[PDB]
Design a protein around this ligand. Structure first.
Ligand code: NI
Length: 341
């Protein structure tokens, strides 16, 4: 059964609610982004209207085989009427295709659902500038001050410099990058660009990337692993065993691996600056865990919410324990007293 924080009152709408069977009274199902925790349930057998971005719609069609007649892509930054209600989709600064949804309810209430997001000051000059929001359904993944991590630009600088240095010292090193979902593609695209190589991967991953409207993509990726000195592998193979196993396959072309494991936040952020990060090493294999986040840091979230000044906040992450829910409400009240709304 569909929880309350996935329903939009006064409409026939749900958001990210595909794993509960038929939702009583739902005439349109919104999907914020193509991550499995949110799409859980969709397939070729789905027969209700799905509203989403163009990129999400390409993924639904090609990866889940949802029939074309049930896919409803909307452009961003544009007022659209769906089942007699005005909506807008806004870029969430999460993974490719990810959106926030503004709903202009028939009774005059305005609701913003963030989906998954990485808050940014650029959002203060979207269509949000204009107006009041009565209810914010907020991605609270990192809603506590201990959650600190660098900018994406700093993390990419570190990865580019690390890989360019290694391969310049040893032209026979291979670079490997772990993946498990869409998102974080800049990690492997930036490294391949500094090395003058395409990125090699499986046919399944290549298909996924071909759905993302990335300009000049045919110039950047390939399924010919042997022609490539940046390889992608599933995230679970990014360990000393899995990497040794991979180096055997390459046929004595390479004599070293340098690997990257992009993560979310980890507790070594509480001590170590991005510059100071060191790898785990066994023999001719080195592995770097790098904190490339696509969710808001505490400070980013606080800034966005103190700017928006919503009337009420409904968290959509960390809602399962009394202690979590209690801690989040304390922070929402400080923010409100500090800023005066
Ligand atoms: Ni997500």
């Amino acid at each position: 059964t569909c929880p309350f924080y996935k329903k939009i009152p006064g409409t026939g709408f749900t958001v990210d609610a595909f794993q509960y069977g038929v939702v009583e009274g739902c005439t349109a199902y919104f999907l914020t982004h193509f991550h499995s925790d949110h799409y859980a349930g969709l397939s070729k057998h789905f027969t209700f209207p799905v509203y989403c971005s163009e990129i999400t719609g390409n993924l639904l069609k090609n990866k889940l085989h949802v029939q074309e007649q049930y896919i409803h892509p909307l452009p961003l930054d544009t007022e659209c009427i769906v089942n007699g209600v005005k909506v807008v989709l806004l870029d969430a600064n999460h993974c490719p295709g990810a959106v926030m949804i503004l709903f202009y309810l028939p009774n005059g209430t305005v609701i913003l659902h963030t989906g998954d997001f990485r808050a940014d000051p650029s959002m203060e000059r979207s269509l949000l500038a204009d107006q009041k929001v009565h209810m914010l359904y907020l991605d609270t993944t990192y809603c506590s001050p201990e959650y600190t991590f660098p900018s994406q630009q700093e993390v990419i600088r570190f990865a580019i410099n690390t890989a360019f240095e290694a391969v310049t010292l040893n032209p026979h090193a291979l670079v490997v990058c772990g993946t498990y979902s869409i998102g974080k593609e800049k990690v492997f695209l930036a490294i391949a660009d500094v090395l003058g190589s395409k990125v090699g991967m499986s046919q399944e991953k290549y298909k996924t990337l071909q759905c993302l409207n990335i300009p000049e993509i045919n110039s950047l990726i390939t399924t010919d692993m042997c022609s490539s000195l940046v390889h992608l592998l599933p995230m679970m193979q990014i360990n000393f065993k899995g990497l040794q196993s991979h180096l055997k396959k390459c046929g004595g072309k390479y004599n070293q691996i340098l690997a990257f494991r992009p993560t979310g936040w980890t507790h070594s952020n509480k001590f170590t600056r991005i510059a100071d990060v060191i790898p785990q090493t066994k023999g001719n294999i080195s592995i770097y865990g790098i904190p490339y986040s696509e969710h808001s840091s505490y400070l980013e979230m606080k800034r966005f919410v103190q700017w928006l000044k919503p009337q009420k906040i409904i968290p959509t992450v960390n809602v399962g324990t009394w202690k979590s829910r209690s801690t989040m409400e304390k922070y929402f009240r400080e923010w409100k007293l500090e800023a005066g709304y």
